[PDB]
UniProtKB/Swiss-Prot annotation, chain A:
It is found in: Host cytoplasm; Host Golgi apparatus; Host nucleus. This is 3C-like proteinase nsp5. 3CL-PRO exists as monomer and homodimer. Only the homodimer shows catalytic activity. Interacts with host FBXO22; this interaction promotes the proteasomal degradation of nsp5. Inhibited by pyridone-containing alpha-ketoamides compounds 13a and 13b. In turn, alpha-ketoamide 13b (tert-butyl (1-((S)-1-(((S)-4-(benzylamino)-3,4-dioxo-1-((S)-2-oxopyrrolidin-3-yl)butan-2-yl)amino)-3-cyclopropyl-1-oxopropan-2-yl)-2-oxo-1,2-dihydropyridin-3-yl)carbamate) inhibits SARS-CoV-2 replication in human lung cells. Inhibited ex vivo by michael acceptor inhibitor N3. Inhibited ex vivo by compound 11a and 11b. Cleaves the C-terminus of replicase polyprotein at 11 sites. Recognizes substrates containing the core sequence [ILMVF]-Q-|-[SGACN]. Cleaves and inactivates human TRMT1, preventing tRNA guanine(26)-dimethylation of tRNAs. May cleave human NLRP1 in lung epithelial cells, thereby activating the NLRP1 inflammasome pathway. May cleave human GSDMD, triggering alternative GSDME-mediated epithelial cell death upon activation of the NLRP1 inflammasome, which may enhance the release interleukins 1B, 6, 16 and 18. Also able to bind an ADP-ribose-1''-phosphate (ADRP). There is a cross-link at residues 3, 88 (Glycyl lysine isopeptide (Lys-Gly) (interchain with G-Cter in ubiquitin)). The chain holds residues 3266 to 3564 of 7096 of the full protein.
Amino acid sequence: FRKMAFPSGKVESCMVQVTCGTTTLNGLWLDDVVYCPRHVICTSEDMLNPNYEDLLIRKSNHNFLVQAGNVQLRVIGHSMQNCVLKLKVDTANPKTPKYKFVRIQPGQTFSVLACYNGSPSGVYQCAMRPNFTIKGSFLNGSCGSVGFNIDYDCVSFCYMHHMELPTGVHAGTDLEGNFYGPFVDRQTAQAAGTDTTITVNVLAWLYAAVINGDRWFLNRFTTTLNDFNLVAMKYNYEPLTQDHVDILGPLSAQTGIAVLDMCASLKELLQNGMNGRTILGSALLEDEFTPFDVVRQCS
Amino acid sequence: FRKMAFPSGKVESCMVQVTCGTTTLNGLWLDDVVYCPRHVICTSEDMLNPNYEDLLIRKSNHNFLVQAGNVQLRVIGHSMQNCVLKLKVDTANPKTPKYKFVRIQPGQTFSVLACYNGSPSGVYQCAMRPNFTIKGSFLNGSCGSVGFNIDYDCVSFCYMHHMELPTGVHAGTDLEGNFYGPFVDRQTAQAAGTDTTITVNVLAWLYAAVINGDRWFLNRFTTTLNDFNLVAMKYNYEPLTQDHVDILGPLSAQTGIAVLDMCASLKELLQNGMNGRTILGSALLEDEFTPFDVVRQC
Ligand SMILES: COc1cccc2[nH]c(C(=O)N[C@@H](CC(C)C)C(=O)N[C@@H](C[C@@H]3CCNC3=O)C(=O)c3nc4ccccc4s3)cc12
Ligand SMILES: COc1cccc2[nH]c(C(=O)N[C@@H](CC(C)C)C(=O)N[C@@H](C[C@@H]3CCNC3=O)C(=O)c3nc4ccccc4s3)cc12
């Protein structure tokens, strides 16, 4: 059981480079539109307080250099949607996948295709944290990299990359250009809200460990949902809802371990520690696998 | 630091399925050849101790069903090379990337594109253990999935998947069909050697820590390579080779910390423990990031 990203080929065929003046970042080319972070139009003396509508009206189509591989794409129009710029180009992308734009929920996972200069560099899994940051791996020039899920050849784009916080975690928008969390696309040091642990994911991961032949952390005890949530909240874990319990049903039925029995296992791990032992190779409780991630991989 | 796979598109375009009878494995289509594990020709009562040479003489080109999706590729020749079957087909793959077949060493990492019935399902990074197993994620139907690295658009294929050991780790071949480690392609419970920690990668991790300002473990000692290797083996760490010293060269230059000085730092950590301190936030030393991976992410 490992962190597993979706195959990235359908998305790689959509990554382009977008240059405005001195600024170069990545864009996403779908049909005849290139989506990219709007601050491609900012110079260094603009990043602190950019009045984006006022900056954009001053730009012409020919101010935008869009490159797909070695081929330049001519911008024939542009519009802004929140923090995303939509460049209309004179060529539709012939490898546009079936796709959707979705806004994901905290606790859900996606694959990130990290890109530099329009060229894909790496792919890895991320969870949307409860405080709406992600713990990614992004360097200078990574803006415009996207996150996505795939379901039967349909690519659901859910993230475009914009920012690395002082703490080293990452912030970005959906493909409508609305940030996840309270972040703003200006060159300022921004703090996130206090993060918490994704309880339903930790439980899914404990089930994954049992499916894979590890049972050492189980115990003979049970707990009520509310008593578990009282302890969970004390340890900065998100509350577990009945919807979460239902969602864990399939994993519960596969292993024969009731959800509240697994909650009693996690309660013991929170109160007693792991005592130097490991689960699925980790010395820490892992919260970035969803129940679906476990089912998709183990089955 | 994240375990980061290579973008998989160039390899996705090369995955096909190969069927003999009711047995379907994944295959790799490059130019006009498809490569796949040879036991696609096996029946269930042939798997304990297959006579592959005998089994292959009873096969003709027309017994092999090669499909890209639902599109059949006609087989015009077949041959066996070690544990892989090479099927010549009448169509050169137009999406064949620039490629090489390489045989990797323990400690080297690569991306695995897990595939089922020729259809790619997920991608993740793996490290070849010193006992020549990988800690993969493979189910029934995964054989023929490949592992690879990508350097300047050239795909270096290094792994093809064959087997899950009773311990749950995985074993396979290079693309010439030679197994990594002492394993054989038979339906049989096989044990790997006792595994060890990948010293060269731990050193890379320590260099990554220094690069990021976490350097409490640096000391004013040095060691010879031989003295280090004798200590390392007593803690179940791999001995360093000359090649390991050389691949740590760029990180040593970047930090100004000689390789043997970092070895003396690691030796101290082995003999004395971390004493509750951490390195890069972790109480455990990471051994699945190569010097290349560290440079990639730093
Ligand atoms: C005093 O200001 C700070 C104080 C403390 C921490 C801080 N973080 C950031 C911050 O992240 N800024 C954004 C840009 C803002 C405008 C959204 C930014 O540089 N995004 C990167 C990805 C970054 C870079 C490093 N790895 C990350 O993922 C991206 O590619 C883009 N680069 C530029 C460069 C110039 C113009 C546009 C873009 S868009 C500022 C900052
Ligand atoms: C008493 O025998 C055992 C005792 C204790 C542990 C054991 N492990 C294996 C073992 O691995 N066998 C090989 C096959 C051998 C011939 C290399 C095998 O099933 N490979 C799988 C990938 C496996 C499956 C589960 N996840 C893993 O990665 C693969 O895809 C292939 N499937 C077939 C199906 C039919 C024909 C060819 C192939 S090749 C046997 C075994």
